From Swiss-Prot, chain B:
It comes from the Eukaryota. Changing residue 2 to E: In a breast cancer sample; somatic mutation. Residues 1182-1199 comprise a putative nuclear localization signal; nuclear localization is required for the regulation of period length of the circadian clock. The DNA-binding domain (residues 816-954) binds to both single-stranded DNA (ssDNA) and double-stranded DNA (dsDNA), and has high affinity for DNA sequences rich in guanine that form G-quadruplex (G4) structures. It is found in: Nucleus; Chromosome. Residues 1-92 are annotated as: Interaction with PARP1. Expressed in all tissues examined including brain, heart, lung, liver, skeletal muscle, kidney, placenta, pancreas, spleen, thymus and testis. Highest levels of expression in placenta, pancreas, thymus and testis. The modification Phosphothreonine is found at residue 83. Induction: Regulated by the cell cycle. High levels in S, G(2) and M phases, with highest level in S phase. Low expression in G(0) and G(1) phases. This is Protein timeless homolog. The modification Phosphoserine is found at residues 68, 81. Belongs to the timeless family. The chain holds residues 1007 to 1098 of 1208 of the full protein. Monomer. Homodimer or homomultimer. Component of the circadian core oscillator, which includes the CRY proteins, CLOCK or NPAS2, ARTNL/BMAL1 or ARTNL2/BMAL2, CSKN1D and/or CSNK1E, TIMELESS, and the PER proteins. Interacts with PER2. The interaction with PER2 is direct and via its second PAS domain. Interacts directly with PER1 and PER3. Interacts with CRY2, CHEK1, ATR and ATRIP. Interacts with CRY1. Interacts with CLSPN; the interaction is required for leading-strand replication. Interacts (via N-terminus) with TIPIN. Plays an important role in the control of DNA replication, maintenance of replication fork stability, maintenance of genome stability throughout normal DNA replication, DNA repair and in the regulation of the circadian clock. Required to stabilize replication forks during DNA replication by forming a complex with TIPIN: this complex regulates DNA replication processes under both normal and stress conditions, stabilizes replication forks and influences both CHEK1 phosphorylation and the intra-S phase checkpoint in response to genotoxic stress.
Amino acid sequence: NQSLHQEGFSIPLLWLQNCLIRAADDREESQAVPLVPLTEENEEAMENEQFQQLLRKLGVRPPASGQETFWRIPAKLSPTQLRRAAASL
Amino acid sequence: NQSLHQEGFSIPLLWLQNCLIRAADDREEDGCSQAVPLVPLTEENEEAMENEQFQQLLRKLGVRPPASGQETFWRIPAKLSPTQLRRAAASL
């Protein structure tokens, strides 16, 4: 996590943090939500092995082959779980 | 073109068509040729971008697949002229 900050990935990390926090909030107002990278640098991050290994530790699931493009923040993560993952970034 | 249309991909197709055409409009001014990512924003366009026939079509139109390990999205390459792009959109 911090190691990724050191390889030049701080911007995607903060991005991820926000997606996690918004998911946390929206689950207080029930869906798996896609991590949609809209910039070249975030896109670069999702295709990076170390960043992906991090997404798996936070509990994000990779996309279903042949049916999805984006990783999903699974529905099982509680708003609490999400805020805690975000906070370790 | 047509067969995907018959299999239910008319909405994704319409989307693609709009990407090709808007890209052409930007490339009419000289000096403005950027690669454009095909970003699926709905579950159905996503589903499309993971379909093998939709991809085959994308290759026929001159779209390049993503750089494995760097990109997620297919790109409309910068080299294509407004004419080329418009021809692609019209052939769907």
